[PDB]
Amino acid sequence: AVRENALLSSSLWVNVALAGIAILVFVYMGRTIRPGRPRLIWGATLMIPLVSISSYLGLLSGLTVGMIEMPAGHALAGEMVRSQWGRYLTWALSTPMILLALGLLADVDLGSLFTVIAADIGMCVTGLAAAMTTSALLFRWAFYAISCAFFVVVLSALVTDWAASASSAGTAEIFDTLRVLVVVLWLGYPIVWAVGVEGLALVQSVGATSWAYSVLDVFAKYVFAFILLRWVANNERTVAVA
Amino acid sequence: AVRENALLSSSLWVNVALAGIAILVFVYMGRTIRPGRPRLIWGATLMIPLVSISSYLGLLSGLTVGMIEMPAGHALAGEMVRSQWGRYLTWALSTPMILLALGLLADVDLGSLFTVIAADIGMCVTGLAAAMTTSALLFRWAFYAISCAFFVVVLSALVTDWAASASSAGTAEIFDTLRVLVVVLWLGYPIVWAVGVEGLALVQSVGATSWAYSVLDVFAKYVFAFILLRWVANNERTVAVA
Amino acid sequence: AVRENALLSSSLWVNVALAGIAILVFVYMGRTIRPGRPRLIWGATLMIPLVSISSYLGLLSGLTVGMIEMPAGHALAGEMVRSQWGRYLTWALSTPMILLALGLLADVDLGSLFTVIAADIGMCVTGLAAAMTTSALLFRWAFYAISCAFFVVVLSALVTDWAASASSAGTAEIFDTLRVLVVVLWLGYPIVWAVGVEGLALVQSVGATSWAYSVLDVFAKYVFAFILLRWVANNERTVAVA
Numbered sequence: 001a002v003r004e005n006a007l008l009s010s011s012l013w014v015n016v017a018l019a020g021i022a023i024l025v026f027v028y029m030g031r032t033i034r035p036g037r038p039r040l041i042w043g044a045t046l047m048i049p050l051v052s053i054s055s056y057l058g059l060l061s062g063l064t065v066g067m068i069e070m071p072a073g074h075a076l077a078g079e080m081v082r083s084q085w086g087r088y089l090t091w092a093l094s095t096p097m098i099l100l101a102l103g104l105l106a107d108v109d110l111g112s113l114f115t116v117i118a119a120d121i122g123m124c125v126t127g128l129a130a131a132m133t134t135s136a137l138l139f140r141w142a143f144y145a146i147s148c149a150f151f152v153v154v155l156s157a158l159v160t161d162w163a164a165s166a167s168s169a170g171t172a173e174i175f176d177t178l179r180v181l182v183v184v185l186w187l188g189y190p191i192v193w194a195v196g197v198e199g200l201a202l203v204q205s206v207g208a209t210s211w212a213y214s215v216l217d218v219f220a221k222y223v224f225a226f227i228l229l230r231w232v233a234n235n236e237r238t239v240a241v242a
Numbered sequence: 243a244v245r246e247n248a249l250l251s252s253s254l255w256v257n258v259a260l261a262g263i264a265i266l267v268f269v270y271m272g273r274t275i276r277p278g279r280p281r282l283i284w285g286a287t288l289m290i291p292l293v294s295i296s297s298y299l300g301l302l303s304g305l306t307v308g309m310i311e312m313p314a315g316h317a318l319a320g321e322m323v324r325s326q327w328g329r330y331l332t333w334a335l336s337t338p339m340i341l342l343a344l345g346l347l348a349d350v351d352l353g354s355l356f357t358v359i360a361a362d363i364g365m366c367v368t369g370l371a372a373a374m375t376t377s378a379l380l381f382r383w384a385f386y387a388i389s390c391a392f393f394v395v396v397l398s399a400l401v402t403d404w405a406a407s408a409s410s411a412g413t414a415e416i417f418d419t420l421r422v423l424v425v426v427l428w429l430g431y432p433i434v435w436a437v438g439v440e441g442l443a444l445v446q447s448v449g450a451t452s453w454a455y456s457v458l459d460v461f462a463k464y465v466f467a468f469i470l471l472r473w474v475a476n477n478e479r480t481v482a483v484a
Numbered sequence: 485a486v487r488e489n490a491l492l493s494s495s496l497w498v499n500v501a502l503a504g505i506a507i508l509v510f511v512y513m514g515r516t517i518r519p520g521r522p523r524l525i526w527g528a529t530l531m532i533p534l535v536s537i538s539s540y541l542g543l544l545s546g547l548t549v550g551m552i553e554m555p556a557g558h559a560l561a562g563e564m565v566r567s568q569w570g571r572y573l574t575w576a577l578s579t580p581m582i583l584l585a586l587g588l589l590a591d592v593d594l595g596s597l598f599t600v601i602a603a604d605i606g607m608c609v610t611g612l613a614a615a616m617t618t619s620a621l622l623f624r625w626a627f628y629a630i631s632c633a634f635f636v637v638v639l640s641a642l643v644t645d646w647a648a649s650a651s652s653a654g655t656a657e658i659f660d661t662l663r664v665l666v667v668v669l670w671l672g673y674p675i676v677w678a679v680g681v682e683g684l685a686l687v688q689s690v691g692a693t694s695w696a697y698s699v700l701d702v703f704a705k706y707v708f709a710f711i712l713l714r715w716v717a718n719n720e721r722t723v724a725v726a
């Protein structure tokens with residue numbers, strides 16, 4: 001509940017503000033977005049920062065933060081560590097929206113979109129399971145491994161059929177740019193988890209781990225959404241003719 | 243757990259019965275519904291009261307009811323209030339079904355339907371967060387505000403592309419009728435929350451707040467479903483030719 | 485937490501291994517699967533055992549297992565029984581994937597698929613509610629009944645429009661085979677629940693109830709997925725031309 005750690009607190013308030021600014025910027029950027037495909041991607045994009053603000057409020061309020069006892073074998077075994085589990089939970093809604101926006105832009109098959117969102121949800125929930133598991137270190141990492149497997153299913157779409165769809169949709173250029181951002185930035189999350197306090201605890205500062213995720217969110221969500229939306233606004237014809 | 247409040251109890255049992263009657267009435271009304279679009283909307287409609295009964299059983303049984311301590315600043319700060327949080331949770335399944343039924347009727351784009359359901363889920367979960375937050379009054383209302391934002395995303399579809407789709411689908415007349423019912427009745431829920439015990443507590447009776455939601459459910463679900471289904475039965479050609 | 489019951493333990497470890505073997509077998513079987521419809525169903529199929537392993541890890545670790553006090557009237561009223569509620573929870577992700585795979589194979593309408601998954605989720609969550617309800621025996625069984633109603637909605641699709649779609653998709657033969665497996669095997673789950681400790685408790689052994697579900701999973705998931713995938717690999721043309 002209580003929080004007397006400026007490093008930790010700032011990592012949360014900073015994104016409530018940035019997500020707030022993004023929403024306002026995006027609403028504005030869509031001021032003259034033609035109806036149909038464009039406006040639709042605009043809405044899906046607007047919600048990325050909307051879900052994000054919700055996540056940070058959950059954390060700030062303490063609603064989605066808890067103390068978890070680390071199991072034998074862990075660097076901090078027998079100690080209680082602060083787990084921002086609300087991040088893992090909300091990702092289950094925000095990442096599917098990122099994929100929805102990218103999917104619409106690439107005009108992929110509804111079936112493919114379906115499979116990818118399911119895989120994404122699996123990645124998120126198994127990640128939450130890894131954080132919440134306390135009986136044995138083995139199970140925490142086994143969940144981490146399965147979460148990685150779901151992540152691979154998600155990435156497989158980006159490297160295969162979603163790319164072929166963007167080409168036929170005339171959005172290959174922007175898709176290729178956005179694809180690099182997703183693969184590189186999304187890989188940062190499991191690294192932070194593994195290096196941070198809930199993983200190997202190479203970095204034992206909860207404030208530091210929190211800032212890492214917050215910085216990733218700035219680029220994987222706000223900047224990502226800005227780049228996607230800006231392109232759509234300057235290429236309404238191409239996306240509308242889908 | 244215990245409940246010795248007839249006002250409160252009746253508000254729940256009344257809808258177990260009404261939802262039960264609706265199911266039977268709807269199954270009957272679909273007795274001679276031709277396969278395809280019609281029968282499909284019939285099924286989606288049948289589940290609205292099915293999910294509803296589930297919600298009321300959760301409440302009646304006490305499974306989805308809990309005591310929450312109100313934070314400083316609240317009219318009942320320092321007191322425990324009864325929170326029917328199961329309502330907020332089940333809305334996450336029932337409202338998407340209402341939107342699914344309306345979406346099929348209007349024959350909207352799968353992508354649009356997707357975005358709307360996601361926004362709807364966000365509205366529901368942030369509403370639950372508002373009710374469950376106890377650390378500060380500020381966060382309870384911040385969640386209420388974000389939930390309203392998601393609600394606006396949902397309504398935006400009804401006022402734009404979903405309406406244009408119904409027109410091209412030849413279902414503009416029934417859609418326009420159903421749209422008014424959704425906008426007006428759905429607006430009643432955040433008013434009840436704000437006026438009731440979990441919000442401003444202008445009305446401090448949990449029994450009264452419960453009845454308000456129950457009455458809204460009767461119209462937003464049962465009556466709404468009746469009107470939609472009855473039209474579909476008398477206009478199978480128009481919906482089937484979609 | 486603690487578990488000193490070989491009968492119970494083996495029922496869980498056995499499927500971590502079998503689900504692990506299935507994943508490896510399926511990845512292999514897809515080695516030369518042409519892109520498009522085939523590869524897509526391959527991915528959806530690969531995740532069935534992926535979600536399954538996740539479920540068993542939750543159970544093995546104790547994360548998704550709890551003690552529930554049975555209400556008056558129950559054969560074990562006033563006693564605490566072990567509830568593998570993680571099974572019910574994960575089914576909410578794995579069963580929709582089974583239906584997704586079957587739906588893609590049958591090339592059904594996106595709207596129908598949507599309605600079926602929602603009904604499936606309802607069946608799973610009401611089943612979880614039945615297990616978690618402790619105030620009265622009446623409510624436990626009322627949830628069981630509603631869950632059955634959702635199950636009927638799911639089955640209705642398999643006996644109607646999904647079958648007509650498979651015919652037009654040229655996949656009627658494999659669909660008919662898979663449909664029998666789903667109807668017969670899926671019916672086994674509510675029987676186990678009713679006969680086992682959480683239901684009528686005709687069988688009071690948690691180890692025995694666990695093995696029943698595990699055996700059902702072997703056929704409803706692993707064998708089912710094998711049959712589906714093998715057919716797709718030998719009939720790529722038919723599925724691709726969808």
Ligand SMILES: *C/C=C(C)/C=C/C=C(C)/C=C/C1=C(C)CCCC1(C)C
Pocket residue numbers: 088091094095098123124126127128130143144145147148151186187189190193217220221
């Ligand atoms: C807006 C937030 C985003 C884009 C978050 C992305 C999160 C992931 C790619 C998380 C992945 C993880 C694994 C692959 C292994 C288990 C631990 C996680 C959940 C951090």
Ligand SMILES: *C/C=C(C)/C=C/C=C(C)/C=C/C1=C(C)CCCC1(C)C
Pocket residue numbers: 330333336337340365366368369370372385386387389390393428429431432435459462463
């Ligand atoms: C069957 C039940 C229905 C149609 C329920 C609808 C509920 C809403 C439109 C709820 C909306 C709310 C907000 C916009 C603000 C936060 C509080 C809520 C969850 C009551």
Ligand SMILES: *C/C=C(C)/C=C/C=C(C)/C=C/C1=C(C)CCCC1(C)C
Pocket residue numbers: 572575578579582607608610611612614627628629631632635670671673674677701704705
């Ligand atoms: C991989 C696991 C599968 C295919 C599980 C299927 C589960 C069901 C068909 C469960 C159904 C139930 C009812 C119809 C009544 C309430 C109890 C349940 C949840 C066991």
Ligand SMILES: CCCCCCCCO[C@@H]1O[C@H](CO)[C@@H](O)[C@H](O)[C@H]1O
Pocket residue numbers: 073074075076137141144145199200201
């Ligand atoms: C998919 C990758 C899985 C890697 C599993 C790593 C399991 C080791 O686990 C690690 O062991 C260290 C030494 O005992 C501890 O200090 C760390 O806290 C602990 O997380």
Ligand SMILES: CCCCCCCCO[C@@H]1O[C@H](CO)[C@@H](O)[C@H](O)[C@H]1O
Pocket residue numbers: 315316317318379383386387441442443
């Ligand atoms: C989107 C609309 C947000 C409105 C935020 C209202 C915040 C005020 O909150 C209200 O303050 C009153 C006086 O202190 C209390 O009596 C009420 O219980 C409390 O909810």
Ligand SMILES: CCCCCCCCO[C@@H]1O[C@H](CO)[C@@H](O)[C@H](O)[C@H]1O
Pocket residue numbers: 557558559560621625628629683684685
């Ligand atoms: C859809 C089918 C619903 C069946 C409802 C059955 C309700 C009876 O419930 C059963 O009663 C027995 C005798 O009292 C007990 O021994 C069992 O434990 C209890 O589950």
Ligand SMILES: CCCCCCCCCCCCCCCC(=O)O
Pocket residue numbers: 054055056057058064086089090092093096121356357359360363367368371
């Ligand atoms: C278009 C389909 C989207 C499906 C999304 C499925 C998963 C929903 C996850 C909801 C998480 C909600 C928790 C919010 C918590 C918070 O921010 O306080």
Ligand SMILES: CCCCCCCCCCCCCCCC(=O)O
Pocket residue numbers: 065066067085089132334367370
């Ligand atoms: C389909 C969306 C449903 C919305 C569910 C919202 C609430 C999620 C609650 C998750 C609780 C799990 C974390 C417990 C953490 C702890 O031990 O404190």
Ligand SMILES: CCCCCCCCCCCCCCCC(=O)O
Pocket residue numbers: 296297298299300306328331332334335338363598599601602605609610613
């Ligand atoms: C067609 C997609 C629909 C997606 C629905 C996603 C959200 C599921 C919410 C499930 C809530 C289940 C809780 C039921 C509680 C009860 O009534 O006892």
Ligand SMILES: CCCCCCCCCCCCCCCC(=O)O
Pocket residue numbers: 307308309327331374576609612
């Ligand atoms: C995707 C669907 C998942 C189904 C999840 C069903 C169970 C939801 C449990 C929500 C618990 C949150 C409320 C806690 C309330 C309290 O403090 O008593």
Ligand SMILES: CCCCCCCCCCCCCCCC(=O)O
Pocket residue numbers: 114115117118121125126129538539540541542548570573574576577580605
């Ligand atoms: C294609 C849409 C699929 C929608 C799926 C909606 C329901 C998600 C259910 C997630 C359950 C996750 C719990 C996993 C628990 C565990 O194995 O440890």
Ligand SMILES: CCCCCCCCCCCCCCCC(=O)O
Pocket residue numbers: 092125128549550551569573616
């Ligand atoms: C949309 C997916 C959300 C993922 C939610 C994952 C966590 C589910 C937690 C369910 C808790 C309900 C069971 C409580 C059992 C008990 O009493 O021990």
Ligand SMILES: [Cl-]
Pocket residue numbers: 051052055090091094
């Ligand atoms: Cl988020």
Ligand SMILES: [Cl-]
Pocket residue numbers: 008059065082084
């Ligand atoms: Cl924190």
Ligand SMILES: [Cl-]
Pocket residue numbers: 293294297332333336
């Ligand atoms: Cl409801």
Ligand SMILES: [Cl-]
Pocket residue numbers: 250301307324326
């Ligand atoms: Cl109540």
